[PDB]
């Protein structure tokens, strides 16, 4: 089993703020970033997709959503969404494949201030 795990399947964060949602995968000996497949999706949208060495992305999400790639080699795919609209509420789908593959879903609610 190659298992993707998440710290929180539910994030609650107020509007105008920032949030970093996380998907942790096990890192094998001698990890080659070029083999690492990662994508973040909401329903019908591609938030970010990192394949074949670097990053289909939805209309709304640049200036906004970025993968933190300096944490990749250590086995964390971290999607960081800055200024958080109420557009960003929903179910986020995390997926990582290095060799084997697995996925996790995460819920994000966003409350007005």
């Amino acid at each position: 089993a190659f298992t993707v795990t998440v710290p929180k399947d539910l994030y609650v964060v107020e509007y105008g703020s920032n949030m970093t949602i996380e998907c942790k995968f096990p890192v094998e000996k001698e990890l080659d970033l070029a083999a690492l497949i990662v994508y973040w999706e909401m329903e019908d949208k591609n938030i970010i997709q990192f394949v074949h060495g670097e990053e289909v992305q939805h209309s709304s999400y640049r200036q906004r959503a970025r993968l933190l790639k300096d944490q990749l080699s250590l086995g964390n795919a971290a999607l960081q969404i800055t200024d958080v609209k109420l557009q960003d509420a929903g179910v986020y789908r995390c997926m990582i494949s290095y060799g084997g593959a697995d996925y996790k879903r995460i819920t994000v609610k966003v409350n007005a201030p």
Partner: antibody
Amino acid sequence: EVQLVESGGGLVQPGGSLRLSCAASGFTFSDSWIHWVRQAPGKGLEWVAWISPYGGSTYYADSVKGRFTISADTSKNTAYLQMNSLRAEDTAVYYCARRHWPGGFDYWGQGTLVTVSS
Amino acid sequence: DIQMTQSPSSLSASVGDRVTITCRASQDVSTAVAWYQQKPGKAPKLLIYSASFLYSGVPSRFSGSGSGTDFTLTISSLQPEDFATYYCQQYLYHPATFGQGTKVEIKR
């Protein structure tokens, strides 16, 4: 149990089009990982394109990149391989396949033959 | 991209024989190799995944071994059901590539 049923093959011209269809049954299409694999006559298996049906996420082999378009309709439980600007070299049996998450592809369709010729 | 080369291409064995097919990965793929069976006019059948493990429903006479570069698929006692073409495949690097063919025919 879990089945993949393919449609839309046939004979067309170079520069012509086609849409292959993949009918998914017996599993959650929401969480799956779907690929198109092709086999030219006498030749071996070549991977072509994949889609994550949840979001629109797709990625292609450099072979067919920019020509083929892979998509999915979640409400129809179907993935589509849209083949544009075909060449004779694109002639093969086309399979759609489900990713077996631990590794490899567990479920395949029966295949649909696409022949491209003048 | 990674070549997967298989060998031998053709093999003639008998029912009950031990059969060994090997696959050589162009670069280290770790354990990300899988093995398939194919009979003419039929889609590939998944046999082995993660280079070692057996897929559900695949007879225990099918085994697989390796990591890194070299991989072996082994049939302990060759059944009449088992004459086909066998493919190794690596899913680690894009594109997923297939070693192309090992045909097990029946000795006579």
